[model samples]
Target: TTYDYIVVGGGTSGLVVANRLSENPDVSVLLLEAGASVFNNPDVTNANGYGLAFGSAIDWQYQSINQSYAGGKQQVLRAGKALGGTSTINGMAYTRAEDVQIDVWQKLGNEGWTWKDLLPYYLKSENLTAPTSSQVAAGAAYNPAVNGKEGPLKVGWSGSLASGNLSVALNRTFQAAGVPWVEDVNGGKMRGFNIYPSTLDVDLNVREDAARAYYFPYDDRKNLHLLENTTANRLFWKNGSAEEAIADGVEITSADGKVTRVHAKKEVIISAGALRSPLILELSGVGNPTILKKNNITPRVDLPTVGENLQDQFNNGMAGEGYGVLAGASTVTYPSISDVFGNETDSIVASLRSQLSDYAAATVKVSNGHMKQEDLERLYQLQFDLIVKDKVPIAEILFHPGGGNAVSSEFWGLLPFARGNIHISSNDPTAPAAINPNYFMFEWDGKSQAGIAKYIRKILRSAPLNKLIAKETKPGLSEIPATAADEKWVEWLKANYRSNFHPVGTAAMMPRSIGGVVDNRLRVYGTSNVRVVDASVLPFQVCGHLVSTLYAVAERASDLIKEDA
Candidate 1:
């Protein structure tokens, strides 16, 4: 049976678009997902069991190629292999990007793409669950003026408010360190210290995965069909001209050996994700001709920039336990370059600007020259501007207490100058694609990583919080001295760091002139009936978690589709 639309991959973005599209009782939509429903899986439903799903059956656990720039290390990238996508296994930090971060989209030639233009979609997709009185007293502040109270996704504080003085101590320590407190990080700017909300059902005590929030809620809809345990092999395109190859259906493999074709009467929406979506286009012969020919696939659209401009952050952590302390809910702080680097910021900026051209040339060379050096240079400079001139958050430090005074912190560079690519080396649908984040590809990435670690050490040493610390366990002072140089910190960080798992921009949504795979409308350059609505199209990285902005993007993309229809 032909459906009005075939939305491949029932992940976070996929479930969202499918749910919205199926709203028209007349538009039949088929959502093909490779993983089964994990609604009952404890790893998914347990809001507090963050790492319980790792190495489990539902974890994609994609490994990357050696990161030559970062001590030749291969990082494991985790993506949830379930109906709800990574939302099923993510940290659930429900925070959005800084205003200037989104506003930079328009400056890059993405028409009508700005923080202002996207704020409504953010509000439309969010259903903020107001914090309880006690929770508010615990430092959970929010602005009702900016948050939507009617959306499907449940956003709120944890039911169990932390009773320990850790939250209070951290806030005071941050202020002493000169990082002021912000009432609501979600409003536009995401800086300062506060206890951020998570994507969860405060009443039900379950993680609000995309499937739970969007799919399961409307499971009775007749127009929405979800096919589980089905892998989308590639697009079934009609033979026409090289300039006009159009996708009409999807070739999918189910649990059985047989492969079948499912036709989409109207359009095909690819939301597989950053790591997988661009590979779909490659299989359909819409990527670089060189890549397609090497993989034994016939070229269709010859889009040279399908899988370039891949961006992801590197995360490193520290752990310690304190005396007679009570573990509490997590507290997070988004710090800028100035806050993290202080007086050294000016010198770092000057050094980075001087190396901008070399950085661009290196990036373009790695992309097989598919990307213009000048464009890369301009983009890199703009990012530097966002850091120095605009003061957007540069490092995300998340504080967690593991109970019994056991504490740990996860930190990552929010904006890295590094750029990498993900591409398939073979034509087989199930074959692993070559992935490289080029982590620490630039000198500043490591410096920033070191900067945040240094800043964290300061937080640990601050008055109210320092009294609680008994000792540093992971990467202890013995391993990395308190006053160690950046080189020493960089060495430790490279050996211990992991991918933040926020991969984006594999199928970037910029203008074709600048090597974007999709146009601002998110449609592939050569195809009118296919669109991408996922993290794959995020042209740049955001400061906060990927899902919040992804939710907004998918919401807006759904409207764009309906309007065009």
Candidate 2:
């Protein structure tokens, strides 16, 4: 079967890209999702319900190799396998990226990808539902000028906001720490302590997942079609007589168990996600030849960077489970590097700046020279500039007050220098790829994580919030005292940390010479008609949960794809 466009994964970005592509009646779009519809699934509809689908059928529990630097435990990345993708299973936080982070994309040679350019699409993808009168009285607020209320995906405050004026109390506590309250984190700016919005529909009282917001709303369009329980195995390409490989279509197999070649008349867009999309590229013979050859997949484009440059955040909450986020029963603060370091800010900056060269050398060695030390230094410098120079949000901290004296703090280093890779371990499409985020690969990563723990402790021990918390129970002063050195916090962190589930940069969108797999247009280096429109294409990790930015990226990608046609 042939279609004008074939968008794989049918999740957050897939639905958005396919929806906009099918807007013109002449073109037909096909979406292939491995999981069945979760439209009536209870775990999905319950806005307060997260982790309900953690190990369920819908969650793609991608396993990672035992971390050597952090704790010696294999981490599991939870990505939604259903039609709505991870957006269906994530914390539903609607926070977007910092302006400078997106600007780094353009600096890396991705033209028209600056925050200024992406903000419109960010606004376009959002159909904000303002907080109800009661919720507002509960102290939920957002700026209307920055929020878009005339778009597809629903955005609003959750009903489970922290009890009474607790949210206000926490905001003041953060302000005491020099983090001011920003009315909106959804805007390009993200540095603030705010009661953030979620991708929800208060009117319907359901999670506004990619399916509900972008798919079901336009399911009636004759040009749009989605096939559930269909797995996109790999892409088949045409010979490069024109000196560029052509993505003719994909080879897919359905739940019925028959292999079929689906043709794409225009282009094949991959939104299978960071962990899975890289495997598809590897299986399609687009990765390092050494990697592809072992799987009997012939080397084609010679793009070694297909599955490299993997970046994910390191999360440390006391809970044994993931995230531990309770709907709106929390507040978050996005702090700059200086904000977290205090007096040590400038000294720490100088030290990390000096180590940039060595960091680059270590990264290049880790990549087996897949990434140039030169390029790594440049990229690290950009990250350094963002955190220290531009003062973009570098760490995210959340406060959750449990009933009574019980409380939990969720926090992570927003930008970790540790870069890893994911590739096919075996040729089997079903076999999980070798996912390694290399947490704490650098000394600075440990510093960032440890500094954050101290920073949060400072907040919880400060005026208003201190009154709320009784004392640290697990790994308390007996384990890690306040005057303890950085190594102590890191030691505790390595033992307790979990994967943040926010992976990106597997199929990075940047210039080709700098180990970039996809060009600025989201097209693979040597492929003419294949583009990746998922978290896989993000060159670097942003501040938010990533769904907000993914929607905007996919929205803009849809326009770029249309323009080319």
Candidate 3:
């Protein structure tokens, strides 16, 4: 079937595009997904059901090609295969990127794309819930003017916070540590700790999933058609024109083994996510000739950056029994350069730089000879600035209260510059691609991750907060008893860690020369009407969670797509 736009992957961004494009009723939009619709799933309906969605059938739950970075082990890369994409299954924490961090996009070959230009869109997608007395008391804050009151997405503070005296006592500890209490982090700055809101309608008590917020509410619209349980194989291109591809439909096989072709008239958009977008591109014959030749596939785009610059941080929790009752909760803390690393600044910097050449060469070699040194170096430099110079705007630490003696301060670095890729095993869209995030592959990455974990440990045991600890439960005084010794923490870290699952930069948006597959407008390079919108295009990981920024970016992208037409 033909239409104005054929939207692929009805996730966070695709839903936004479909909703906005269909506003002009004459322009019909078709949204495709590989998984069945989650319109009535309990996980998608309940905000608290966030963790329950993890490993469920709706999730892509992709396994990383063995992580040479993480001691040659495999890592789990979770992307939502269902209708709402990652947002449907992601932790409902609604946090946006720091303004300075978003500005880096412009420096990376994107103009008029800074956080300022995108602020309108950010606000556009926010349907924030007014804070209650309890919410404010709990430390959740926001700028009223910065949020959209009438938008489809219902974003608000959590009404049901895990209660106890720990919350109040923890706030005092953070204040003592010099991290101020931030009322609202979404105000272009996210330095202080607060009980941030989730992207949910508190009144409805249901998840503000992308489909619910942007698509399902309007699914009955005549101009918008959503295909459930259908996987898009590859882009069917026009025979002659290199820039233009004929709107022949997608070739998809149903779970029941029935194959169907649904044609598109004008354009196609892929929002399958960071891991799969590039795989889809390569499957459609849009990657490096050398690698494609090895796989015996025709080259359509010849863009080597199609699946480069993969990034994610490892997560591990520290909890145990302490002396006190551990009744209260603590606010989250993000340390700047001085705060995260103090006297060892020079040592860390020198150490990271020393391994630059090795890190670069090893990564490129594993990518099957696709990426280059200069590109990896540039990315590394950015990470250094973030950690060493105290400018990198990621690596968040959240403390869940009342561990009693058992607490897990969930933590992960905002950005980890370990390069890996996701490519198709077959031209079949139904087949999962070979994805390698290369977690902890580079020695430097290991150092940074270990360092962050150690830092988090310090936060847990610091000052008045430590007074509440009953005892060391998980690692205890034995596993990682020494809080000050870096070496001890590093070794313990290597032993225990799990995937943060925030993958990005796979189908990067930069000039093709710089390992970018898509341009600033999210359009795949060398293509006339195919675009990818999802975490895949994020140039780098943001300090804030992915869904918050993703929804805003999708809102902004919806406008850009409209302007293009």
Candidate 4:
């Protein structure tokens, strides 16, 4: 089959691009999704239900090898294998990136890609419904300027929204703790306490995934065709110039193990997400030569950054019993640098600044030269400026109180200085890639993770929230002291922490002189007809969740492709 465009992985980003491209009616689009379409899956559609699809057939429950720094225990990375991608199984938070952080991408050598340039796209992709009276009373708030009402993807408060006075109580608690209330975290800044909106169909009271917004509605479009349960093996390139390569088609395999070829008349867009996209690039002969050589695959391009710069966050939580009269679930508070470090902010900033060079050197050394020292230094400097120097929120502490009795605080450091990589471990495309996030690889990462743990403890023990607590259950005083030392906190964190499953940056966007896999336009450095439009191309982790930013990026990427066409 041949089409004007072939989009691999009919997931979140891919579907968005497919829909946008097919809008012209004359343009034919082919979308190949490795997993089957779950358009009517009840578990996935249920807004209140999550993690039910996890460990099921739709979940690609990829497990990482033992982390030497994190108690030598393996970590499980969950991703959706169905048509809608991880949105099918993920916690449906619709938070956008901090404005300044988006501008950081421009500072990192990406011309014309700034917060202002992307904000409209963020608005363009959303279908922001006004909150209902009950929802508004439940603390659902937003700034109309930061959201769009006419877009396809729905963004609103859940119908089964968390009730009771919990939101107000938490808002008060956070305010008393020095974190102000943010009217809408989606707007430029994300610090303080917020009642987050989710990707949900407010009218239907269901989860609105990418497929629901972009695919199924346009299923009747004659130009748009979807191939289900088909995995792309590799991109076939035109045999010609060594200076550049053009992707002409894709070789794919089906569930019945039948291989076929699908040609693209225009270009091939890869949206296989972070974990799988790097492997796809490598299999197509566009990754580090060393990796391709080791895997017995011939290299087509010497792009060393294809599978490098892998970044993911650590997940850990604490449980405390609280008897507060105001209680419900689904509450979160984002703490700024001042809130997390308190008095030690200055000292910690100084120490990290002093060791910036060491951190960069360690990143390069560990990446096996896949990431250059100078490149890593530049990236680390930007992160330092955003985190320590600029005082963006350093940690996300989600307050979940089950049945209004026990408080479970799930927290993670928003930014970790550690660098890792994922590469094809075998010549065969069916084989899984070597996934290593190198959690807690640096002292700073460990400290950040451990520091957040201690900070959560302080929140549980302070003021109105503390008075309501019956006792600490997980990591009780007997397990670890409330005012424990850094070493003690690190010990507990190493034992309990798991991967947050938000992997990104496996194919970072930056200058080619550095270890960048894609340019500002998302074009793969050495290829003119191939581009990546998923979380893999995110140069660094954002203060907001991944999906919201991904949708906007794909929207803008669609425009970039259209402009060139």
- Name the lDDT of candidate 4: 0.86
**lDDT (Cα, tens digit) per residue for candidate 3, span 152-205:** 778886667544656665677767766667777777777777777788878878
| Candidate maximizing lDDT | 1
Which residue pairs overlap in candidate 1's backbone? none
lDDT of 4 by residue, 1-565 (tens): 8899999998889999999999998999999999977878999999977778978999998878778777788888899999999888888889887888989989888987788999999999999988888777777789999999888899898776656645566777778879988779988888988888899998898899999988988999999999998999889898885679899899999989999899999999999989998889899899888878887878888988887899899988898876655375377778877788889988888888898899899888777877778878888999999997677888888887566577677889999888888888787887767788989988778888777888777777766666677677778899897667889888888888878888889888888887788999999988988999999999999988888999999999999999988
- Residue-wise C-alpha lDDT for candidate 2, range 385-503, written one tens digit per residue: 88887899888887666544456678899988889989899988888788889988888898989898887777656777556555666567778876898888888999888899889
* Ordered list by lDDT, greatest first: 1, 4, 2, 3
Model 3, position 230, has a per-residue lDDT of 79
- C-alpha lDDT of residue 400 in model 3: 72
TM-score of every prediction relative to native: 0.98, 0.96, 0.94, 0.98
Model 4, residue 80: distance off in Å is 0.5
What is the descending TM-score order? 1, 4, 2, 3
How many collisions per candidate?
0, 0, 27, 0
In Å, residue 562's CA in model 4 sits off its true spot by 0.5
Which candidate do you rate higher for TM-score, 2 or 4? 4
Candidate 3 has its poorest 10 consecutive residues by lDDT at 321-330
